Ligand binder design. Structure first.
Ligand code: HEC
Ligand code: HEC
Ligand code: HEC
Length: 81
């Protein structure tokens, strides 16, 4: 609650399995300001992005571009368990 990062943030959607983001994992390499507010709001579901947006470097795609981290264009299961 509040400004505390949830261990896991879920993204609901139809068709594909919901996506999941782990603060626990990412906090092992990044500080809050490396993602907030430039990439994400300090509020879940405030702004929704698509896989296409990620392909353009937005949302998860800002890092999951095949160079900084595994591409968001593949490995669907990694983020949609
Ligand atoms: C990028 C790798 C992140 C880092 C580093 C941190 N956060 Fe985060 N946070 C991130 C995402 C992808 C999301 C989900 C956004 C969405 O569209 O749903 C979040 C969300 C939060 C929230 C809101 C949670 C909620 O409303 O239930 C908070 C309060 C939050 N994050 C806090 C936070 C803090 C304080 C961090 C440093 C310890 C931190 N996050 C790092 C991505 C990333
Ligand atoms: C983590 C780096 C991801 C990978 C790899 C894939 N997806 Fe994803 N997807 C992810 C998130 C966090 C979200 C929600 C973002 C938000 O702000 O709501 C999504 C969303 C989708 C959606 C809905 C939007 C759209 O593009 O139509 C679908 C249908 C979806 N994702 C499918 C999908 C498939 C099939 C993937 C492999 C080719 C894939 N995603 C990978 C995070 C990540
Ligand atoms: C850069 C600031 C990142 C943002 C924004 C997001 N992720 Fe990430 N993620 C990043 C790195 C450098 C790594 C490690 C290297 C690699 O390629 O794996 C990761 C890893 C993940 C993982 C796997 C975790 C594990 O158990 O090994 C997942 C499933 C993942 N990232 C998902 C994810 C989603 C859904 C994001 C958008 C909401 C997201 N990441 C943003 C760097 C960054």
């Amino acid at each position: 609650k509040g400004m505390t990062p949830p261990k896991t943030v879920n993204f609901k959607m139809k068709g594909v399995a919901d996506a999941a983001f782990s603060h626990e994992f990412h906090l092992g390499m990044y500080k809050c300001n490396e993602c907030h507010t430039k990439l994400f709001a300090y509020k879940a579901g405030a702004k929704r992005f698509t896989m296409a947006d990620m392909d353009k470097g937005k949302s998860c795609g800002a890092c999951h571009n095949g160079k900084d981290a595994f591409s968001s264009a593949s490995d669907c299961g990694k983020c949609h368990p």
